[PDB]
Design an enzyme around this catalytic site. Structure first.
Site, PDB file in Angstrom:
ATOM      1  N   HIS A 173      39.687  41.113  43.596  1.00 19.38           N
ATOM      2  CA  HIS A 173      39.433  42.576  42.972  1.00 19.38           C
ATOM      3  C   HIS A 173      37.869  42.725  43.306  1.00 19.38           C
ATOM      4  CE1 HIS A 173      37.239  40.121  39.835  1.00 19.38           C
ATOM      5  NE2 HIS A 173      38.230  39.637  39.821  1.00 19.38           N
TER       6      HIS A 173
ATOM      7  N   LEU B  58      45.887  36.355  43.360  1.00 24.50           N
ATOM      8  CA  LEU B  58      46.008  37.111  44.640  1.00 24.50           C
ATOM      9  C   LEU B  58      47.153  38.008  44.745  1.00 24.50           C
ATOM     10  CD1 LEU B  58      43.609  35.377  47.308  1.00 24.50           C
ATOM     11  CD2 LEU B  58      43.092  36.486  45.007  1.00 24.50           C
TER      12      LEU B  58
ATOM     13  N   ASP C 202      36.427  32.872  42.978  1.00 21.28           N
ATOM     14  CA  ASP C 202      36.849  32.965  41.370  1.00 21.28           C
ATOM     15  C   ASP C 202      38.189  33.671  41.559  1.00 21.28           C
ATOM     16  OD1 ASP C 202      36.636  35.754  41.585  1.00 21.28           O
ATOM     17  OD2 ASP C 202      36.268  35.628  39.423  1.00 21.28           O
TER      18      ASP C 202
ATOM     19  N   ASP D 258      42.607  45.349  41.184  1.00 25.65           N
ATOM     20  CA  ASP D 258      43.080  44.198  41.896  1.00 25.65           C
ATOM     21  C   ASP D 258      43.108  44.487  43.723  1.00 25.65           C
ATOM     22  OD1 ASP D 258      43.125  42.417  39.667  1.00 25.65           O
ATOM     23  OD2 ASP D 258      44.773  41.435  40.654  1.00 25.65           O
TER      24      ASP D 258
ATOM     25  N   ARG E 281      32.155  29.064  45.812  1.00 27.84           N
ATOM     26  CA  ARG E 281      33.277  29.222  44.788  1.00 27.84           C
ATOM     27  C   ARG E 281      33.796  30.496  44.813  1.00 27.84           C
ATOM     28  NH1 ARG E 281      33.500  31.933  39.657  1.00 27.84           N
ATOM     29  NH2 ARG E 281      34.373  30.433  38.260  1.00 27.84           N
TER      30      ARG E 281
ATOM     31  N   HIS F 282      29.258  29.763  32.550  1.00 27.92           N
ATOM     32  CA  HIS F 282      29.083  30.901  32.336  1.00 27.92           C
ATOM     33  C   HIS F 282      29.788  31.726  31.378  1.00 27.92           C
ATOM     34  CE1 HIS F 282      31.522  32.806  35.516  1.00 27.92           C
ATOM     35  NE2 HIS F 282      31.694  31.662  35.831  1.00 27.92           N
ATOM     36  N   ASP F 283      31.100  31.003  31.225  1.00 27.91           N
ATOM     37  CA  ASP F 283      32.327  31.657  30.467  1.00 27.91           C
ATOM     38  C   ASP F 283      32.345  31.141  29.129  1.00 27.91           C
ATOM     39  OD1 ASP F 283      33.496  33.547  32.065  1.00 27.91           O
ATOM     40  OD2 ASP F 283      34.322  32.453  33.368  1.00 27.91           O
TER      41      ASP F 283
ATOM     42  N   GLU G 257      50.650  39.201  43.527  1.00 22.33           N
ATOM     43  CA  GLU G 257      51.757  39.856  42.539  1.00 22.33           C
ATOM     44  C   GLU G 257      53.264  39.617  43.008  1.00 22.33           C
ATOM     45  OE1 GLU G 257      48.600  41.951  42.976  1.00 22.33           O
ATOM     46  OE2 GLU G 257      47.832  40.482  41.566  1.00 22.33           O
TER      47      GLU G 257
ATOM     48  N   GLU H 271      38.087  28.252  41.117  1.00 24.90           N
ATOM     49  CA  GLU H 271      38.239  27.980  39.929  1.00 24.90           C
ATOM     50  C   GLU H 271      39.651  28.464  39.516  1.00 24.90           C
ATOM     51  OE1 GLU H 271      36.569  31.290  36.158  1.00 24.90           O
ATOM     52  OE2 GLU H 271      37.764  31.931  38.188  1.00 24.90           O
TER      53      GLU H 271
ATOM     54  N   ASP I  24      31.183  43.875  34.348  1.00 17.28           N
ATOM     55  CA  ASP I  24      31.706  42.475  34.016  1.00 17.28           C
ATOM     56  C   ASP I  24      30.505  41.701  34.722  1.00 17.28           C
ATOM     57  OD1 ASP I  24      32.720  40.064  33.405  1.00 17.28           O
ATOM     58  OD2 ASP I  24      34.275  40.223  34.920  1.00 17.28           O
TER      59      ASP I  24
HETATM   60 CA   LIG Z   1      45.303  40.502  43.189  1.00 17.18          CA
END
Ligand SMILES: [Ca+2]
Ligand SMILES: [Ca+2]
Ligand SMILES: [Mg+2]
Ligand SMILES: [Mg+2]
Lengths: 548, 548
Positions: free
Chosen positions: B101, B209, B204, B174, B202, B313-314, B211, B246, B58
């Site tokens: 992650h 974070l 991201d 994650d 920054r 960049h996205d 769940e 972000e 990525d």
């Molecule tokens: Ca997570």
């Protein structure tokens, strides 16, 4: 109405447009292969610079054969193919008749310099073709036009042992229009090309035809006489054809070249008087000199039409401005001495305007919105620059930039093998500035010019309508109306580089609805006393219609 | 007061910015040698994209080592020299902390996929750095973010015979933030860099974070707690260092990533809600959109500052927007199907706006005038395009185009040898879009951007003032005041591609004269009932000052 009143003109030099055989000179077959481009630009009429045989001392304005094609540019059959293929697309094409003077290599002048009397017994018929002087003291108090290169309009000829006259270079001896044989010679050269199906002539340097001792030798009545003979011939023998005059004089003098309705002269004249005032008004952010100089142009006859323009193949000329204005124009637009030539400025449109597209757009707007027919100068539709290290006015005549390949697509010869080198710098060179990239860019200067001409072509009031300046309360803002056949347009233009407010006097139009020509965005009705508040951005243009 | 409130940010990626050594990859020495360029442009703070060792599945956001420099970009040595030369020019530098992650090839996941207990008998303390399940059935009611590539947020590991959780690619598992050893491990990573003098991070993917079953797994109360503790550590220990986040969410959820005065969270957040409405108001020629969503933003804490952007960049993300608004966006801005990706549009800004300089200047005006701190995406200052022959979102990460030379100046390696090919097409290629050209052009976009930036810093109400929309009478015209320390700015913007009229409701400011920010040209005084008529040309912006 006549075709020329509704036409858009495009001024090129076939030596500089498109080379078809790799010798680095543009030619007629190369021009022919580009006719679709000009058609799709929205052009109607091509005005070609001189194409005749010539030593090219004034880049072809010194003709040595009025009835041939310069061997650089192809053959007379190349010319005939190009004419039927422009006509097949519905273009008109006009030539450049150089009537004041020939080249000194023209055989008339090789004959004339022998002298009044031949080595043979008899008198020399060709001596009287030119203008001769024993001492060269006549026609004093007569300016020198080419001021950076000639010190006198007389020049000594070793052969004749006499002086010959020339308003331009010594290589260009003036023809003597007091000799009726010369007037026929001119008529017969015009007939040769009209017979071929050319649509008319831009006639070069008309004010300087006749000389007279004790005058300025510009704009003399005898000159106007000869010109009326030319129009009378064309009317009689080629109805439909266009005569167009280059006559860089003051408003009072230029308008005389239309003649009158009783005694017609030219169909068209360039509007030299406004051109410099557009540029000055952008630097003073005051537009009154446009209004003053426009207001000194009288109305013209029914057949007449102004030709309007921003730049051309020559210097931005300052010969017919006030002394104050010329000093101001030099400081404003020629900050390096290299940028001047004679009494003018040798720069293309984009670099004159610091390459600022908002300004280039504004000026092209005013060009297109004033009473006349616009002529565009090749390359200004893509924002071409100039090469100031080139002698004379050649830095303004560099090759057309077609793509980013070899020599900008103009030739497959290398830049330094081209007649003039194509421009190669980071700002204006053909890597950045060319037709191909601008054909594919949705917001091109080229795309803009096309769409903007489309907009004019859908509103005949631009070609045929009257003109009336609206009061504004702000010299930065120029407003005027164009009326014809019921339509009333209102053009509003800001010569200032930031936001300006104005108060338009629309009192004649109370109760009317301004809408934009593009998409008819509505504006408030003109109400009350008709004083109309507006605000405008830097270099904004508003093309409006006042709906009744 | 706090340096980030008054700063201009510039987002770049070391690998595509400048190559020093000729292997076709951008490096920190190359970036160092361009710091003059960014200093002169008007940029205050560089915002770098992940520079850590990675398999780049990525594109660096899959980290394999939080305390090193990816060997493509140089050594930790070179990064040190980089921070010094940035700081010596008064430039702040923030990094990207990728926190949710890591890469499959991080040592922790390699050690962790070896079961809950090892071969030898001992417990594996790493198995719980990541989130496992046996059936892969927990956490439905959960979306897939990379909708185009991934079908499930669970992915079986062959070697551990369980499923691990990942919000993004299965290559980015994650991290498990219920495990307190993970939190320590992140504080450990951040302090490594803060200690070297980085000026902030920054962060991201911040909303993902934590769940929890039954829930959305976005924006969870326990997520803000970890973040709150990150703010605490930084404030307590590296005061004055910046935390930017972000968080692509609806307005009411994004505002709580600032937290509160009592419990601070992030210093700054990206204003995702407004950015897609700028683009939609342009096409609809209707700024109601922008006003609706700005009014749904609640007020932010005192330390808080929004970060505004047009692009990054996205992809241009459309996830947080209405079904009808998304359909409108696609039709207007994604004519080709493979311009869509992940409920977004992967194009750079200049292609989005048809390369229309008037449209580009207009939105940069609004970026620069809305309340917040603006971030420029590298190459937007010169008008770069994109390449859709590159996979995923890489089409907007082409090498910076410095001049017309080899590979656009980005590298001496020739274009096929570059990590990403430099763009070469006729409209946006480096032969025509590049920095050296625009340094020389008096009227370039790079020069317009620098001047506009220094016009902004001259007026601190842009960075710090409040915001008040103004009634206008015409949806195409957006108008608002920024007020700060007795200065009132007035910002009027025409989002239509033709002239528009409006009635500005200026009653509060009766008696005061609107003055132009560029040149101090004065407009007429607000009289009567404050109803102030204006006209504006296509895409016009007025930057005004109100003086009593
Ligand atoms: Ca997570
Ligand atoms: Ca003469
Ligand atoms: Mg040739
Ligand atoms: Mg490298």
């Amino acid at each position: 109405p006549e075709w020329y009143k509704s036409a858009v003109f495009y001024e090129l030099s076939v030596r500089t447009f498109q080379d078809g055989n790799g010798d680095g000179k543009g030619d007629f077959p190369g021009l022919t292969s580009r006719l679709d481009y000009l058609k799709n630009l929205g052009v109607d009429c091509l005005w070609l610079l001189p194409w005749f045989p010539s030593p090219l001392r004034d880049d072809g304005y010194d003709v040595a054969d009025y009835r041939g094609i310069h061997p650089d540019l192809g053959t007379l059959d190349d010319f005939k193919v190009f004419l039927r293929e422009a006509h097949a697309r519905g273009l008109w094409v006009i030539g450049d008749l150089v009537t004041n003077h020939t080249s000194s290599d023209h055989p008339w002048f090789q004959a004339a310099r022998r002298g009044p009397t031949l080595p043979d017994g008899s008198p020399n018929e060709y001596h009287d073709y030119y203008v001769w002087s024993d001492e060269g003291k006549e026609y004093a108090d007569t300016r020198i036009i080419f001021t950076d290169t000639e010190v006198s309009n007389w020049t000594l000829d070793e052969q004749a042992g006499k002086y010959y006259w020339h308003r331009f270079f010594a290589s260009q001896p003036d023809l003597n229009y007091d000799n009726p044989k010369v007037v026929e010679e001119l008529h017969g050269a015009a007939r040769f090309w009209l017979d071929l199906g050319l649509d008319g002539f831009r006639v070069d340097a008309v004010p300087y035809l006749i000389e007279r001792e004790g005058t300025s030798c510009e704009n003399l009545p005898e000159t106007h006489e000869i010109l009326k003979g030319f129009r009378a011939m064309v009317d009689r023998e080629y109805p439909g054809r266009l005569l167009l005059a280059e006559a860089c004089q003051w408003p009072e003098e230029v308008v005389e070249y239309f003649g009158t309705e009783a005694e017609p002269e030219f169909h068209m004249c360039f509007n030299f008087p406004v051109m410099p005032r557009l540029y000055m008004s952008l630097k003073r952010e005051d537009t009154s000199s446009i209004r003053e100089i426009m207001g000194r142009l009288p109305k013209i006859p029914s057949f007449g039409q102004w030709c309007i323009f921003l730049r051309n193949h020559d210097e931005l000329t300052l010969e017919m401005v006030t002394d104050d204005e010329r000093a101001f124009m030099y400081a404003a637009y020629a900050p390096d001495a290299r940028m001047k030539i004679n009494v003018g400025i040798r720069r293309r449109l984009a670099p004159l305007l610091d390459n600022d597209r908002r300004r280039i757009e504004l000026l092209n707007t005013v060009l297109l919105a004033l009473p006349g027919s616009p002529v565009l100068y090749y390359g200004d539709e893509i924002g071409m620059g100039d090469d100031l290290g080139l002698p004379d006015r050649n830095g303004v005549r560099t090759p057309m930039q077609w793509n980013a390949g070899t020599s900008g697509g103009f030739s497959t010869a290398q830049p330094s093998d081209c007649f003039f080198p194509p421009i190669q710098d980071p700002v204006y060179g053909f890597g950045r500035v060319n037709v191909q990239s601008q054909l594919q860019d949705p917001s091109s200067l080229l795309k803009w010019t096309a769409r903007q001409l489309e907009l004019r072509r859908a509103h005949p009031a631009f070609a045929h309508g009257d003109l009336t300046f609206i009061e504004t309360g702000n010299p930065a803002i120029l407003a005027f109306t164009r009326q014809y056949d019921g339509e009333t347009l209102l053009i509003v233009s800001n010569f200032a580089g930031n936001a300006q407010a104005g108060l338009l006097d629309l009192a004649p139009f109370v109760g009317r609805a301004p809408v934009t020509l593009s998409g008819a965005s509505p504006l408030p009705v003109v109400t009350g006393n008709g004083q109309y508040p507006v605000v405008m951005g830097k270099y904004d243009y508003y093309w409006l219609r006042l709906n009744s």
